[PDB]
Write a protein that binds this ligand. Structure first.
Ligand SMILES: Cc1cc2nc3c(=O)[nH]c(=O)nc-3n(C[C@H](O)[C@H](O)[C@H](O)COP(=O)(O)OP(=O)(O)OC[C@H]3O[C@@H](n4cnc5c(N)ncnc54)[C@H](O)[C@@H]3O)c2cc1C
Ligand SMILES: Cc1cc2nc3c(=O)[nH]c(=O)nc-3n(C[C@H](O)[C@H](O)[C@H](O)COP(=O)(O)OP(=O)(O)OC[C@H]3O[C@@H](n4cnc5c(N)ncnc54)[C@H](O)[C@@H]3O)c2cc1C
Ligand SMILES: Cc1cc2nc3c(=O)[nH]c(=O)nc-3n(C[C@H](O)[C@H](O)[C@H](O)COP(=O)(O)OP(=O)(O)OC[C@H]3O[C@@H](n4cnc5c(N)ncnc54)[C@H](O)[C@@H]3O)c2cc1C
Ligand code: SF4
Ligand code: SF4
Ligand code: SF4
Ligand code: SF4
Ligand code: SF4
Ligand code: SF4
Ligand code: SF4
Ligand code: SF4
Ligand code: SF4
Ligand code: SF4
Ligand code: SF4
Ligand code: SF4
Ligand code: FES
Lengths: 79, 137, 296, 662, 411, 84
């Protein structure tokens, strides 16, 4: 239930934070999908986090490790 | 030929104390208001106000304790609701609702009691004689 | 992109133009748009002009305010003294009716009225607010780390004081400006009596230069003892004092510090990659070259 | 009806504003008036004699006195009316002094006379309709309650018990004693503060007439002067006294205060008695001189490891599953003695209280200097544990301050206790110097000025300047105190090893909640309010509740004890009599006008109204003991089925009608 | 069938279904309740004479409710005050009462003031688009319709026009045209906005019944568990037929209700500004009220007037013998009733001196309502002065932005 | 509290210095006016033996019984009770 922050100023729209998030990958890549909500979607060229109320993230670091030009900061402390 | 007839109904525990304190401190004000002195302003029935206005009060004043400072824990909330409703009735019967007001005067506000007296007198003087006295005939 | 009228008083445009240039560039890089103010003048400088005549102080500050009122925009400032004049006259004339009346019948001779419809902000205050660009956005915009530099902050007096008249919180040991310097990557250091006046306010800079310089020298001694490599500041008065006054201290006394004095907007430009030539660091009395060697 | 009108001159206070002769002639021509007459001082014995003679001669039904305020002289003239063959409540005043003369003195005389005639007419109209009332007498339960176990609470409890009244002593904390138990030495006599209290604590603990209930709160209070139904919350202490253990069946006993439990407990938490400077286990006593030596368990911090019960062994005093028990107690009177706490001085940022290590306040200094405190009585610097050699005392810290952060009043004892602390440091650390940054040394009490002289003689430095700000040296942790020596006329920079703030005091935590439970109001200052600020500093406006101690305003231990005994005497007055008379202003339901709607029932704050069965009809029932005479219900009831005894609708409407009579 | 269902209902008995104004469901439900002994009596309206005479009736023989079938549009009476006065407030006996919107509001006002037992009373509510005074209906038919009134068989307000069925045919005139010419529904009925009594236990009407059942089915809305039980019992014992309502019918029912709300608002406007403003309204009120002969019919007919002795009868308010009575008489009713007036019109229509009591009282009520937010007659909410609250009182004093109660209260 | 009490005053009236005060700090109440009720209470109380214009010549005894001798100075004027 952590909080992710995306630096819009250096986001290129690469979409490798959307493809690599394992909560996004739940809908289409799971047998009998449990939850179909998504943290990121690239609207107007930058990654927007729809997870406003910080309910779905799991601090996995797959998205921080994925962005090619580090731009996603993961906060492990309560918002 | 005309002198305003203003009637005040002041509670015993803050407004009477405040008027007494103003008198003790020798705060002058015009001699136009005469008071009734009930225990709480919760005692003030609507029919008292309406009876005053139909006998011909050019103005009516009801003075009590501040919210949260009633001697009887909550008796001036009842009075406040009653006087809000009285303001509405006088506006809809076509009498000027600024002939009536309710002030919250504490036991230590003799100066504020004097200022209330002055302002009530001024407002009623601006308003003029009440219309009931000629509408009766 | 929030839009503000950019007041731009006397010292930044006419002595330290790199400050205003970096202000516009860095504010645009973060989500802020700084619009020129059309025919603004000296905010009647609060010391040297308020000491003479408070009524003309009110009238001139109100004229500056009604320019941006006609522009229908919120003032943005980069000077603590200009903040005092503009913001405080705005606040006083939003609440004092007889002063509104007096200023309005003075201004009616130039076809101009004050109604009190806009708000006044300091640029660092905007950089700190979270609705507008925040500390995180500043960190995002920073592209050159400026790491390994000890930087001493001078808050000034007219931005934060008196706290019964402002809304910035504690005046005894604020840390907000230290967070903006920490965002840039430079480590802000703490020195003795960090909330002391620089000595240039109130016209003392002009009336008694030795007295003002002694007040400044107390600060410079504390800052050198801490070990600063530059002094950030949010006021062109204080920058002028700390910059010229180092030279006047070197000549009137025998004290040498050679500590560069930079506005926070100049440091923000350096962090965001602007060039020293584009910042006009050659226009300062005190050479910035050692600090540039450290942070570059 | 036959009414007599007696108009006082008040010795020209009224005759110098109106025409008393004209008022009297108007009263004579008024309807229902049998006799109208005047006198210079109607409150004096010839004035009462005049009233009584008039009553006897003219067969008066009622008496109207045109004089000072009712709040000033109802009892006098009601007793004068009684003596004379009338009921006390056939009497009514017309305030023509404090609401006519003193406010219409200047340049307006016939206007004041007309106002006086109007007031006399309204008073006569009411009195022609007043009728007989008899005050209600209610029995008084022969117990008393004292909330607060400080010096003021203990003194009040001992006083009541030795007068013979059974007393409850409620203390929220596990021990009695209060702040004086935390004090080390006492000004101006320099006696061991804790030691003087110890016999009195033993007296309280042993008295058969005192029910000492420590670690207990007051959940709710309902009732009146007669019977107060007070509900107490017995917080889960976790440990059984020997009496309770024997009651529960453990013959071997309960808690004997051996200390094995706290010897084995592994949890360590700050001690609130030592202002946090010292550790204490989860099962603990504040200090070794606590009166009930019973070793509370702190259930917010206990981990239920069960080592304590094994240590206690066969005594079996520890019950880790204990819960908050509730008890309801009926009492006749109540004494409030809640004391005080130190104002939060970390809000004054210029004196770095929380941010600099070596800045403390005066109760922490008193614990540090006490020989039973966290140190061995050795004052050492918090930053490094070294002995200070220069100590500063910031007097007025947060006091006489109108900026909205501090308190606008003087805390009374902070000048005296700062002198005591300066003496203590100068005598305990050889060669140490005390600096007092002061702004009006206030040594007003008995031997206080001599104490001040003696402290200056021993060599404390008195710098008359309020401290401006405090800076901490980065390395030595020394404190640079900046102010101006106003008498010398120069700024100063005194560098001290330890800075002590003489912080202001404020009402204790929860005191406002408790005084709202009991119905007491607050002062401008925020302390509990007294009935009359001059002549009744103990009683409150709500009958049967009395104040004692710092809860009514800051005071030294002598003044606190005098106030506590005064409150005990006032609380004993109605208990010894056993009767008390209530004012007959009650609501009385007229049943054959009540329609049983039940809408008035929720308008009573005191729950005096209810719906009951009388003659098959459901009508409203007034508990005349619970009614207080406010009049809300009777001003509501549309059918006029509620009668207010001395302020009935016919009476008030007669007053209105008489005002508009011309 | 469950508390919110909207149904079509008609009577199994063909004679009951003929004599019903629509499908006879109100008379089948009342008959079933009586004969299965849910209730001990039934208070309904029957014609005593020509259809212009509506007479309330307590019925205990289940054989007499076929006489109660049919709706009388000239029945301008109010039932709940009769149950308090002559049926002991239904404190011992269960009743089932057929009621219009004003009769449901009056039930709730009297139950607030503890004068009836709504645990005992079952309220079958009917939709009401308005009622006409019987004598005014007679004059209407004599003059505007050009018919002898004794000829009329039935007469109803349907689709906003006044259909009468006489020997020869039927006729129709727009009720708005009649109301302009000085006839039509009562004034309070023109101002009324309680069109579907959703506070009752069942709401029956001819609105929303479309198609093959346009005159032989009643639109039922189940508004409570008690009504659901009554309906389910009647359907199971086979006294009543139930089919789920048509969604198009529900939609146009909503539209007609909303249009009736708008028309009520328009009449409220034109009437309340017709009374005047300022000292002109005081001369209107005072000159009208100087006519009162103190018959007390307004007090005895008002649902909200439940007091054993009225304050208008107390000698310190009103002089007993002075006949050109004071304005205090009507000020005492404005003070006591205007906070909860259900606009039933009984005070206006029973006044021998033709004083617009209901117009004055409703003009005050509407804005006591928009001031305090209290809608009379909807549920068990206590009256505004019977329940004063600390937080709300603080709120109204703070909203004035003032230290007293003097100004900045109205717009 | 119910105990019979003797009130000895050397001067012909009770009241003391507060009877001489005009207004009282900090409440500015009329000093004489606030005192007037309590003086009346003392003068009327049946349990108080008010002995004005009287001194204490000698005291002997202890906690139990104090044999106090009073000097009733010659007032020169008789109260109604003494006259009767
Ligand atoms: C640093 C310092 C030094 C001082 N030195 C001296 C000195 O040398 N000499 C001197 O004469 N005076 C001195 N004083 C003043 C002295 O402490 C007070 O005069 C005295 O303690 C007043 O006692 P009290 O009983 O009224 O209040 P407290 O001692 O505070 O006692 C109140 C008691 O009531 C309890 N309580 C509070 N609220 C409740 C509740 N709701 N329910 C139940 N119990 C409750 C508290 O726990 C406490 O036990 C000093 C004060 C300070 C701060
Ligand atoms: C004055 C009036 C105006 C109406 N206006 C409309 C309208 O505009 N739109 C609409 O959809 N419905 C209106 N109705 C209701 C309409 O008649 C219903 O469709 C009808 O009641 C459905 O019931 P029913 O035919 O099934 O049973 P029915 O057998 O008709 O039962 C009707 C019931 O109503 C009772 N009743 C008759 N007259 C009155 C009266 N004056 N007051 C109280 N109860 C009475 C009868 O005693 C009987 O119990 C009105 C009813 C009345 C009385
Ligand atoms: C100028 C002045 C102004 C003051 N103003 C105020 C003020 O505004 N507010 C305030 O609170 N305080 C004020 N005070 C203080 C106040 O007067 C005292 O607090 C108060 O009077 C104390 O009263 P007491 O009964 O103890 O003594 P006193 O009032 O002096 O009473 C002592 C009484 O005992 C009698 N007596 C004496 N010796 C004997 C004897 N041997 N046998 C018998 N009777 C004896 C005396 O005649 C006298 O009647 C003021 C004091 C002064 C001097
Ligand atoms: S941390 Fe994991 S779960 Fe959270 S947003 Fe990144 S990839 Fe998704
Ligand atoms: S992976 Fe990084 S650059 Fe790509 S869209 Fe996400 S945040 Fe932007
Ligand atoms: S009764 Fe009042 S007005 Fe009369 S003399 Fe006494 S104090 Fe003065
Ligand atoms: S071990 Fe038992 S008896 Fe001993 S102090 Fe602890 S609880 Fe009391
Ligand atoms: S149960 Fe454990 S933690 Fe709790 S008091 Fe006993 S030993 Fe300490
Ligand atoms: S007692 Fe002394 S230190 Fe305390 S507030 Fe008063 S003047 Fe200041
Ligand atoms: S006294 Fe009045 S309000 Fe109370 S129950 Fe009776 S009628 Fe109702
Ligand atoms: S007057 Fe009425 S409301 Fe007030 S306390 Fe008495 S019974 Fe209750
Ligand atoms: S008042 Fe309303 S509900 Fe009653 S009959 Fe008239 S229109 Fe129908
Ligand atoms: S019904 Fe009409 S005439 Fe009768 S009392 Fe009421 S207002 Fe007067
Ligand atoms: S005042 Fe008239 S219109 Fe209002 S509820 Fe009573 S009877 Fe009906
Ligand atoms: S007018 Fe008032 S007093 Fe009279 S019956 Fe109606 S509610 Fe009762
Ligand atoms: S005591 Fe004054 S308003 Fe209640």
């Amino acid at each position: 239930a952590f909080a992710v922050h995306v630096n819009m100023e250096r986001c290129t729209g690469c979409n490798n934070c959307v493809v690599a998030c394992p909560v996004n990958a739940l809908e289409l890549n799971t047998v009998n999908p449990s939850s179909t909500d998504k943290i990121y979607k690239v609207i107007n060229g930058d990654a927007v986090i729809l997870d406003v109320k910080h309910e779905l993230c799991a601090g996995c670091g797959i998205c921080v490790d994925a962005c090619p030009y580090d731009v996603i900061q993961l906060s492990g402390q309560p918002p | 030929d005309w002198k305003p007839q203003i009637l005040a109904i002041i509670c015993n525990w803050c407004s009477y104390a405040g008027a007494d304190l103003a008198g003790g401190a020798r705060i002058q004000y015009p001699p136009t208001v005469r008071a009734i002195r009930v225990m709480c302003t919760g005692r003030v029935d609507m029919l008292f106000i309406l009876k005053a206005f139909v006998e011909g009060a050019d103005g009516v004043l009801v003075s009590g304790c501040h919210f949260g400072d009633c001697h009887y824990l909550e008796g001036n909330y009842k009075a406040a609701k009653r006087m809000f409703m009285i303001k509405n009735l006088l506006r809809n019967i076509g009498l000027d609702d600024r002939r009536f007001r309710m002030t919250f005067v504490s036991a230590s506000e003799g100066a504020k009691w004097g200022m209330v007296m002055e302002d009530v007198t001024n407002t009623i003087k601006e308003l003029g004689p009440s219309p009931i006295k000629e509408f009766k005939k | 992109m929030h839009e503000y009228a950019f007041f731009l008083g006397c010292i930044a445009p006419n002595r330290y133009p790199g400050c205003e240039a970096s202000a516009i560039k860095t504010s645009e890089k973060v989500g802020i748009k700084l619009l020129p103010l059309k025919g603004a003048s000296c905010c009647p400088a609060p010391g040297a002009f308020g000491s003479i005549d408070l009524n003309v102080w009110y009238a001139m500050a109100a004229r500056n305010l009604v320019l941006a009122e006609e522009m229908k925009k919120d003032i943005a400032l980069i000077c603590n003294g200009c903040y005092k004049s503009i913001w405080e006259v705005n606040h006083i004339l939003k609440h004092n009716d007889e002063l509104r009346d007096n200023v309005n019948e003075v201004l009616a001779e130039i076809d101009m009225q004050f109604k009190g419809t806009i708000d006044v902000w300091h640029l660092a205050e905007l950089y700190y607010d979270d609705k507008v660009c925040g500390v995180q956005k500043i960190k995002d915009s920073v592209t050159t780390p400026l790491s390994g530099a000890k930087v001493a902050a001078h808050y000034g007096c007219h931005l934060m004081k008196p706290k019964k008249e402002r809304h910035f919180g504690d005046t005894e040991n604020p840390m907000w400006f230290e967070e903006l310097i920490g965002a840039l990557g430079a480590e802000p250091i703490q020195y003795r009596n960090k909330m002391q006046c620089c000595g240039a306010g109130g016209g003392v800079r002009g009336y008694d230069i030795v007295h003002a310089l002694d007040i400044t020298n107390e600060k410079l001694i504390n800052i050198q003892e801490a070990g600063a490599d530059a002094i950030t500041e949010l006021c062109p008065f204080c920058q002028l004092q700390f910059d010229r006054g180092q030279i006047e201290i070197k000549e009137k006394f025998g004290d040498v510090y050679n500590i560069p004095v930079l506005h926070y907007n100049e440091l923000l430009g350096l962090a965001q990659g602007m060039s020293p030539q584009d910042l006009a660091l050659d226009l300062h009395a005190i050479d910035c070259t050692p600090f540039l060697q450290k942070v570059l | 009806p036959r009414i007599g009108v007696f108009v006082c001159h008040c010795g020209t206070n009224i005759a110098g504003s109106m025409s008393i002769d004209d008022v009297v002639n108007y009263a004579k021509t008024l309807p229902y008036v049998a006799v109208a007459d005047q006198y210079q001082y109607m409150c004096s014995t010839p004035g009462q004699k005049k009233i009584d003679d008039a009553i006897k001669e003219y067969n008066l039904t009622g008496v109207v006195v045109a004089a000072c305020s009712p709040r000033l002289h109802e009892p006098t003239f009601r007793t004068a009316t009684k003596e004379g063959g009338l009921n006390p409540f056939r009497f009514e005043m017309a305030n023509i002094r404090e609401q006519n003369s003193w406010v219409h003195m200047h340049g307006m005389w016939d206007e004041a006379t007309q106002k006086a005639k109007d007031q006399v007419r309204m008073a006569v109209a009411k009195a022609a309709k007043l009728e007989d009332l008899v005050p209600k007498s209610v029995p008084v339960e022969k117990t008393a309650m004292v909330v607060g176990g400080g010096v003021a609470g203990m003194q009040a409890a001992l006083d009541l018990a030795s007068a013979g009244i059974k007393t409850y002593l409620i203390e929220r904390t596990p021990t009695i004693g209060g702040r004086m138990s935390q004090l080390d030495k006492t000004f101006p006599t320099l006696d061991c503060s804790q030691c003087i209290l110890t016999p009195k604590m033993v007296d309280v603990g042993r008295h058969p007439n005192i029910e000492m209930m420590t670690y207990t709160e007051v959940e709710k209070v309902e009732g009146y002067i007669g019977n107060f139904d007070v509900t107490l919350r017995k917080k889960a202490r976790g440990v059984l006294t020997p009496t309770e253990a024997t009651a529960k069946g453990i013959v071997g006993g309960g808690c004997n205060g051996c200390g094995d439990c706290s010897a084995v407990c592994p949890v360590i938490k700050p001690n609130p008695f030592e202002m946090g400077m010292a550790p204490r286990k989860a099962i603990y006593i504040y200090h070794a001189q606590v009166m009930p030596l019973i070793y509370t368990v702190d259930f917010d911090s206990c981990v239920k490891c069960g080592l304590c019960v094994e240590a206690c062994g066969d005594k079996k005093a520890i019950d880790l599953e204990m819960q908050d028990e509730f008890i309801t107690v009926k009492v006749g009177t109540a004494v409030l003695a809640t004391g005080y706490e130190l104002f939060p001085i970390e809000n004054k940022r210029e004196w770095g209280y929380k941010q600099f290590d070596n800045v403390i306040n005066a109760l922490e200094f008193e614990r540090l200097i006490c020989a039973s405190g966290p140190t061995g009585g050795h004052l050492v610097r918090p930053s490094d544990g070294k002995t200070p050699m220069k100590v500063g005392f910031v007097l007025c810290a947060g006091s006489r301050d109108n900026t909205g952060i501090g308190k606008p009043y003087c805390s009374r004892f902070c000048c005296m206790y700062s002198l005591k602390h300066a003496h203590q440091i100068m005598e305990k650390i050889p060669g140490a110097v005390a600096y007092l940054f002061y702004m009006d040394i206030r040594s007003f009490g008995k031997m206080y000025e001599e104490f001040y002289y003696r402290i200056q003689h021993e060599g404390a430095k008195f710098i008359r300047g309020r401290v401006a700000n405090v800076l901490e040296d980065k390395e030595t942790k020394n404190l640079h105190v900046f102010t101006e020596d106003t008498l010398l006329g120069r700024p100063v920079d005194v560098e001290v090893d330890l800075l002590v703030l003489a912080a202001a005091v404020q009402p204790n935590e929860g005191a406002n909640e408790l005084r709202k439970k009991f119905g007491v109001s607050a002062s401008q200052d925020g302390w509990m309010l007294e009935a009359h600020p001059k002549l009744n500093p103990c009683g409150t406006t709500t009958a049967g509740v009395f104040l004692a101690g710092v809860c009514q305003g800051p005071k030294d231990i002598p003044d606190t004890v005098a106030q506590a005994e005064g409150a005990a005497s006032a609380a004993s007055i109605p208990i010894h009599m056993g009767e008390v008379e209530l004012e007959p202003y009650f609501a009385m339901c007229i049943d054959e006008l009540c329609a049983g709607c039940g809408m008035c029932v929720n308008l009573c704050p005191y729950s005096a109204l209810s719906l009951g069965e009388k003659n098959g009809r459901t009508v409203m029932v007034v508990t005349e003991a619970k009614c207080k005479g406010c009049g809300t219900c009777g001003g509501f009831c549309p059918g006029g089925a509620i009668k207010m005894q001395h302020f009935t609708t016919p009476q008030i409407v007669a007053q209105i009608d008489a005002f508009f009579a011309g | 069938a469950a508390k919110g269902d909207m149904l079509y209902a008609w009577a199994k008995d063909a004679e009951i279904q003929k004599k019903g104004e629509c499908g006879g469901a109100v008379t089948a439900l009342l008959k079933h309740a009586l004969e299965t002994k849910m209730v001990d009596a039934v208070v309904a309206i029957k014609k005593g004479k020509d259809l212009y005479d509506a007479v309330p009736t307590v019925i205990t023989n289940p054989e007499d409710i076929i006489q109660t079938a049919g709706s009388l549009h000239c029945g301008t009476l109010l039932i709940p005050k009769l149950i308090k006065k002559y049926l002991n407030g239904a404190k011992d006996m269960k009743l089932a009462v057929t009621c219009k919107g004003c009769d449901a509001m009056a039930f709730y006002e009297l139950a607030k003031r503890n004068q009836i037992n709504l645990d005992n009373i079952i309220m079958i509510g009917v939709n009401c688009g308005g009622s006409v005074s019987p004598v005014t209906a007679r004059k209407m038919i004599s003059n505007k319709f050009g018919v002898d009134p004794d000829t009329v068989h039935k007469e109803e307000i349907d689709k906003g026009q006044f259909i009468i069925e006489y020997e020869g045919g039927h006729k129709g005139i727009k009720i708005d045209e009649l109301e302009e010419e000085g006839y039509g529904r009562r004034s309070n009925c023109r101002r009324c906005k309680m069109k579907i009594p959703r506070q009752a236990d069942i709401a029956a009407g001819n609105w929303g019944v479309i198609g093959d059942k346009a005159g032989k089915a009643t639109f039922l809305e189940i508004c409570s568990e008690k009504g659901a039980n009554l309906v389910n019992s009647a359907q199971s014992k086979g006294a009543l037929e139930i089919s789920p309502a048509d969604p198009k019918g529900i939609d146009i029912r909503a539209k007609v209700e909303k249009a009736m709300f708008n028309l009520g608002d328009e009449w409220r406007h034109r009437d309340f500004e017709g009374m005047g403003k300022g000292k002109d309204r005081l001369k209107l009120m005072m000159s009208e009220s100087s006519k009162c002969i103190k018959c007390y019919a307004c007090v005895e007919a008002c649902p909200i007037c439940y007091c054993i002795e009225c304050s208008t009868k107390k000698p310190w308010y009103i002089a007993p013998g002075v006949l050109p009575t004071s304005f205090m008489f009507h000020l005492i009713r404005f003070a006591h009733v205007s906070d909860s007036c259900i606009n039933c019109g009984q005070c206006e229509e029973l006044c021998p001196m033709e004083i617009p009591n209901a117009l004055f009282m409703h003009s005050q009520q509407v804005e006591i309502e928009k001031m305090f937010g209290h809608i009379p007659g909807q549920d068990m909410t206590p009256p505004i002065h019977a329940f004063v609250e600390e937080k709300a009182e603080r709120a109204r004093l703070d909203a004035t932005g003032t230290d007293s109660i003097y100004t900045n209260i109205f717009t």
